[model samples]
Target: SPTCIPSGQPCPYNENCCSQSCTFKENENGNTVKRCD
Candidate 1:
């Protein structure tokens, strides 16, 4: 089933989410958050 993953979730691969674009970025707290872009 396709789960509801937000933009700031830890996605190892792009196909892991509905966005189909996984990327890495620093959050507001300076933490590396790998999510779907």
Candidate 2:
């Protein structure tokens, strides 16, 4: 099932259990970047 909270931030339930920081770093090629950590 999808999120019933309808919130658009990051964690709708709890920050500790549902929130994680996402970082984006450009590679040596300086191309596009997408990552989640």
Candidate 3:
């Protein structure tokens, strides 16, 4: 699937976000999760 996700959605890269910004945080498993902000 395309990474071009909207806010509140998961993104793999900054450009993947409709906002053109992405925030990364650690999950319970310490895996990096990206979100559009």
Candidate 4:
């Protein structure tokens, strides 16, 4: 990948994040989802 993902975007792994951080966050939909934190 040429671009690093920012926070609030969906991510399956920490390697795809620009902040070097990623975790599963419960969004407003009431479902667990992975994102850059």
Candidate 5:
């Protein structure tokens, strides 16, 4: 996870994640947030 968003971090997209596996869970209308996997 060098110079990238770790599995437990927030990311705008998968590419921003170290593993390139951003998981986007629909929390609500304004909660379309994501985290690295």
Candidate 6:
């Protein structure tokens, strides 16, 4: 989906990996927290 994933939400590895519910990388900014989809 091209829609926004929100501020602190799970983002799939990419469009191809969306169905797997896994994130390719973690958010390390510290401004927000998010886990794998």
Which candidate should be chosen as best, given TM-score against the real structure?
4
Clash counts for the predictions, in order: 0, 0, 0, 0, 0, 0
Per-residue lDDT of candidate 4, residues 1-37 (tens digit): 5588888888889988878798998889889988987
In the order shown, the candidates' Cα RMSDs to the true structure are: 2.8, 8.4, 2.4, 2.1, 3.0, 7.3
Model 1: lowest-lDDT 10 consecutive positions = 1-10
Ranking by lDDT: 4, 3, 5, 1, 6, 2
Model 5, residue 18: C-alpha shift (Å): 0.6
Residue-level lDDT of model 2, residues 1-37, one tens digit each, is: 4532222333322432223443344667877453333
Q: How does candidate 1 fare on TM-score? A: 0.49
| Candidate 3 displacement at residue 11 in angstroms | 0.2
Stretch of 10 with least lDDT, candidate 2: 4-13
Regions of model 4 farther than 4 Å from truth:
none
**Of 3 and 4, the candidate ranking higher by lDDT:** 4
Model 3: per-residue Cα lDDT at residue 10: 84
Number of the candidate with higher TM-score, 2 or 3:
3
Candidate models: Cα lDDT each: 0.75, 0.38, 0.85, 0.86, 0.83, 0.46
> lDDT winner among the candidates?
4
| CA displacement after TM-score superposition, residue 1 of candidate 3 (Å) | 10
The regions of model 6 sitting more than 4 angstroms off are 14-37
- Writing each residue's lDDT as its tens digit, candidate 6 over 1-37 gives 6764543356544342334444544356755433345
For residue 12, give model 2's deviation from the true position in Å.
18
Model 1, position 9, has a per-residue lDDT of: 74
Model 1 Cα lDDT, one tens digit per residue, 1-37:
5584657677877777558788988889978867876
1 against 4, candidate with superior TM-score: 4
TM-score pick, better of 4 and 5: 4
Error of 5 at 37 (Å): 0.5
